Each structure stands twice: as structure tokens, then as C-alpha cells.
Design an enzyme around this catalytic site. Structure first.
Site, PDB file in Angstrom:
ATOM      1  N   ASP A 234       7.054 -39.046 -47.429  1.00  0.00           N
ATOM      2  CA  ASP A 234       7.708 -39.278 -46.140  1.00  0.00           C
ATOM      3  C   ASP A 234       9.067 -39.932 -46.383  1.00  0.00           C
ATOM      4  O   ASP A 234       9.172 -40.854 -47.199  1.00  0.00           O
ATOM      5  CB  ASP A 234       6.864 -40.255 -45.322  1.00  0.00           C
ATOM      6  CG  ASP A 234       5.553 -39.657 -44.853  1.00  0.00           C
ATOM      7  OD1 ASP A 234       5.407 -38.424 -44.887  1.00  0.00           O
ATOM      8  OD2 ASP A 234       4.663 -40.428 -44.443  1.00  0.00           O
TER       9      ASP A 234
ATOM     10  N   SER B 211       2.695 -35.088 -50.972  1.00  0.00           N
ATOM     11  CA  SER B 211       3.903 -35.052 -50.176  1.00  0.00           C
ATOM     12  C   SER B 211       4.465 -36.465 -50.048  1.00  0.00           C
ATOM     13  O   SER B 211       3.801 -37.453 -50.355  1.00  0.00           O
ATOM     14  CB  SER B 211       3.588 -34.476 -48.801  1.00  0.00           C
ATOM     15  OG  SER B 211       2.709 -35.345 -48.101  1.00  0.00           O
TER      16      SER B 211
ATOM     17  N   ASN C 180       7.950 -35.831 -43.209  1.00  0.00           N
ATOM     18  CA  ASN C 180       7.100 -35.486 -44.342  1.00  0.00           C
ATOM     19  C   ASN C 180       7.547 -34.184 -45.006  1.00  0.00           C
ATOM     20  O   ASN C 180       7.895 -33.213 -44.325  1.00  0.00           O
ATOM     21  CB  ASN C 180       5.659 -35.353 -43.852  1.00  0.00           C
ATOM     22  CG  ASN C 180       4.699 -35.108 -44.981  1.00  0.00           C
ATOM     23  OD1 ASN C 180       4.382 -33.973 -45.276  1.00  0.00           O
ATOM     24  ND2 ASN C 180       4.242 -36.167 -45.625  1.00  0.00           N
TER      25      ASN C 180
ATOM     26  N   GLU D 113       7.541 -47.122 -38.452  1.00  0.00           N
ATOM     27  CA  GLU D 113       7.525 -46.181 -39.573  1.00  0.00           C
ATOM     28  C   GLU D 113       8.323 -46.704 -40.767  1.00  0.00           C
ATOM     29  O   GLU D 113       7.906 -46.530 -41.915  1.00  0.00           O
ATOM     30  CB  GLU D 113       8.091 -44.822 -39.146  1.00  0.00           C
ATOM     31  CG  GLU D 113       7.224 -44.048 -38.165  1.00  0.00           C
ATOM     32  CD  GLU D 113       5.972 -43.489 -38.808  1.00  0.00           C
ATOM     33  OE1 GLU D 113       5.841 -43.549 -40.058  1.00  0.00           O
ATOM     34  OE2 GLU D 113       5.096 -43.008 -38.066  1.00  0.00           O
TER      35      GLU D 113
ATOM     36  N   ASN E  14       2.292 -39.771 -49.978  1.00  0.00           N
ATOM     37  CA  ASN E  14       0.980 -39.534 -49.389  1.00  0.00           C
ATOM     38  C   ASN E  14      -0.003 -39.053 -50.451  1.00  0.00           C
ATOM     39  O   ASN E  14       0.382 -38.610 -51.535  1.00  0.00           O
ATOM     40  CB  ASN E  14       1.073 -38.503 -48.264  1.00  0.00           C
ATOM     41  CG  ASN E  14       2.106 -38.881 -47.223  1.00  0.00           C
ATOM     42  OD1 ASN E  14       3.064 -38.146 -46.977  1.00  0.00           O
ATOM     43  ND2 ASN E  14       1.956 -40.068 -46.663  1.00  0.00           N
TER      44      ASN E  14
ATOM     45  N   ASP F 240      -1.796 -36.444 -50.577  1.00  0.00           N
ATOM     46  CA  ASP F 240      -1.709 -35.022 -50.896  1.00  0.00           C
ATOM     47  C   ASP F 240      -0.537 -34.680 -51.814  1.00  0.00           C
ATOM     48  O   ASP F 240      -0.378 -33.511 -52.181  1.00  0.00           O
ATOM     49  CB  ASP F 240      -1.706 -34.162 -49.618  1.00  0.00           C
ATOM     50  CG  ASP F 240      -0.416 -34.286 -48.809  1.00  0.00           C
ATOM     51  OD1 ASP F 240       0.451 -35.110 -49.156  1.00  0.00           O
ATOM     52  OD2 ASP F 240      -0.278 -33.563 -47.798  1.00  0.00           O
TER      53      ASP F 240
END
EC number: 3.2.1.17
Length: 129
Positions: A52, A50, A59, A35, A46, A48
Site C-alpha cells: 500500500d 502487495s 494497493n 491510513e 500486505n 499477499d
């Protein structure tokens, strides 16, 4: 902070992640490697809108507040910036809630695709725990 592999294993073990919800320590170290490359300051946006955050790429749509993800939740009750600290406590505490949500570690896409079903014990091999 960029952790070493065994340094992170030891910190995760001290914070109670070994066998948390049935997931052995190697699973958590493997998830962190893919990750974030063990970097507490990692961020990724991301599609959308959002973002991380941190060593486990938690998230902002559900788990933390970053002030720029409209309609999102803050289920861990923390600013997302708290997940970038060199102290992994906030990330670990929030991860415990995520992994208890019903989908286990499948919530981490890199764990599902790169750790699940592999010899995850290899990630802690040689560490003094």
C-alpha cells in the site's frame, strides 16, 4: 511530506474531492489520517505480497505498478512511486477511480472501521476552505 490537517483538507478540496461520489471532505481527511497519519511517503506490505502506497494507502494488487506484485493490475496506470510524491494529484486521481468502483469508501479499511458513521465534519472544523 507530512501534511497538516487543514493543509490537506484544502489540497483535497482544490482537487475536487469534496462531495466526490457523495463523500464530504471530512471523510477523505479522516481516511488519510488513519491510513497514513497524513504522510505521503507511507508504505505498508500486505500478507499477499502487495504493498500500500501514499497518503491514501493505495494497493499495488489492483491500482498501480511496483514491479513486484505478480499477476497484479495497474488500473490507475501509474508507478506506485508516483503515489509517494509531496504533490497529491496522482493519489487523488487514483482515489477517484477506486471510490467509483462500486464499493465506495469501503475500499479503505481504516475508513470503514474508524470514520464511517462518525462525525467526520470534525476533521475540517476550524479550517479556512
Amino acid at each position: 511530506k507530512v501534511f497538516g490537517r487543514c493543509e490537506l483538507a484544502a489540497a483535497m478540496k482544490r482537487h475536487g474531492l469534496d462531495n466526490y461520489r457523495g463523500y464530504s471532505l471530512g471523510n477523505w481527511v479522516c481516511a488519510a489520517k488513519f491510513e497514513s497519519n497524513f504522510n505521503t511517503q507511507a508504505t505498508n506490505r500486505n500478507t499477499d505480497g502487495s504493498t500500500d502506497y501514499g497518503i491514501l494507502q493505495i494497493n499495488s494488487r489492483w491500482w498501480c505498478n511496483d514491479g513486484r506484485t505478480p499477476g497484479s493490475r495497474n488500473l490507475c496506470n501509474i508507478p506506485c512511486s508516483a503515489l509517494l510524491s509531496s504533490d497529491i494529484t496522482a493519489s487523488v486521481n487514483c482515489a477517484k477511480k477506486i471510490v467509483s468502483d462500486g464499493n465506495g469508501m469501503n475500499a479503505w479499511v481504516a475508513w470503514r472501521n474508524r470514520c464511517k458513521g462518525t462525525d467526520v465534519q470534525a476533521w475540517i472544523r476550524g479550517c479556512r476552505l
